[PDB]
Each structure stands twice: as C-alpha cells, then as structure tokens.
Design a protein around this ligand. Structure first.
Ligand SMILES: [Pr+3]
Ligand SMILES: [Pr+3]
Ligand SMILES: [Pr+3]
Ligand SMILES: [Pr+3]
Ligand SMILES: [Pr+3]
Ligand SMILES: [Pr+3]
Lengths: 115, 115
C-alpha cells in the first residue's frame, strides 16, 4: 500500500538537472541563435507540447528559430528546476515564448501576471 | 527572480510516467525474469546509483538477475510515481532489492520500518 515520497519528484528533477549540467545522458541538442543546449527528449516532451509533437513524430540536433536563446535558457532552466527566473520587464517576453513551445504552466501564470 | 512552481516536478514525473505507460521515448529495456521493462536511462540514473553507474560507464537491453521481476516492478513504479506500493510482509524484500540497486530513499525508509 503506497508509501508516499513527497520529496521524490524534486529529487528526480534534481538528478536530471545534474545530468544536464554535466552533459550526461542527454540525447538531444537544442540549437538556438548559434547556441547549443544538450538536454533530454523525454524531459522536454513532459513539459512542452511543441517538443512532445517534435519528438514523437533533425535527428540529434533540432534548431528553434522562433524563440530567443535568452528565453529558451530561462524556460529550459524552469523545465529542469521548477523555478522560472524572470524580471518584471521580461514577463511578456517569456509569455510569448511559452505559448509557442506550449508550456501551459508558464503561459497561464505569465498571462495572469500581465492581466 | 524565481517564480516557484511547486507542482512542476510532479507534473514532469507524471509526463515521464505517461511516456513509460505508452512506450514512448523510452531508450532502454530492463530485462528481469524474462520480463521486459521499457524505461528511460535518465530517470533510472536519477534515482538508482546502480543504474547511474551502469549507464555512464548490453546496449539497448540490460538484464538484471539479482532482483525479482516483482520487486523491480514495484521499484520502477516508485521511480516514476513517488509512491512505493508494498505490503507489510514484503517490506524486507523491497529493502533487499533497493540496497542492491542503491535507491537510498527507499532503503532508508524500509530499514526504518523494520527496525
Ligand atoms: Pr540530486
Ligand atoms: Pr490589471
Ligand atoms: Pr493594465
Ligand atoms: Pr501529465
Ligand atoms: Pr523495533
Ligand atoms: Pr523487532
């Protein structure tokens, strides 16, 4: 009968972030403005519908031309840590990018912060 | 400045569990007592030191002969949901398996439940 581990999902995420930090067990590179982001297909697909569609339908490197390197870094950081670092002036920029990547947790929140 | 998402890691884990359930974006198969478990290398490595060592050092299928299919199913379920389903009689069995896979969250708890 289910022993609950309330810290487990965050411990998992931390471990995946360690992998990302260390360039370990990353199976895809996102390329944005000439900048490369080694990540996990699976983690991206679990929080972005753009990426789920992309990976469940090039081969190791995928270019994104419709978000800034700066927004993608903030959103990839969010994906892997559960914290979105944003300044008051940039909320609308992150909203625009999260809608295009279809990361609804971030889109809903940022839209609420703008009215 | 970090907007915190307290539900995000569990939403990520849920998404990875969906992938596992649906056989999507799984990059390894664990083989135990003739039974195959499509999973993610990255998720296994984030919670088991046995698996982190295994994957950061065959190629798509990895046999485990030192835990039961029944214990591995319970521990893989835990890995992907943050709940360990166990009966009162099986705590010691799961403890034995978690120590061999080096899943310290489960080992510490099960040892405490046995004294
Ligand atoms: Pr960790
Ligand atoms: Pr307003
Ligand atoms: Pr206004
Ligand atoms: Pr989900
Ligand atoms: Pr006692
Ligand atoms: Pr006793």
């Amino acid at each position: 009968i289910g022993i609950p581990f309330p810290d487990h999902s965050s411990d998992i995420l931390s471990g995946l972030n360690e992998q990302r930090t260390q360039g370990l067990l990353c199976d895809v590179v996102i390329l944005v403005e000439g900048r490369e982001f080694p990540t996990h297909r699976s983690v991206l697909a679990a929080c972005s519908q753009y990426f789920k569609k992309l990976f469940t339908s090039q081969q190791n490197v995928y270019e994104i031309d419709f978000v800034s390197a700066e927004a993608l870094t903030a959103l990839m950081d969010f994906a892997y840590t559960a914290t979105l670092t944003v300044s008051t002036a940039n909320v609308g920029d992150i909203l625009s990018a999260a809608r295009l990547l279809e990361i609804p947790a971030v889109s809903h929140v940022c839209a609420d912060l703008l009215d």
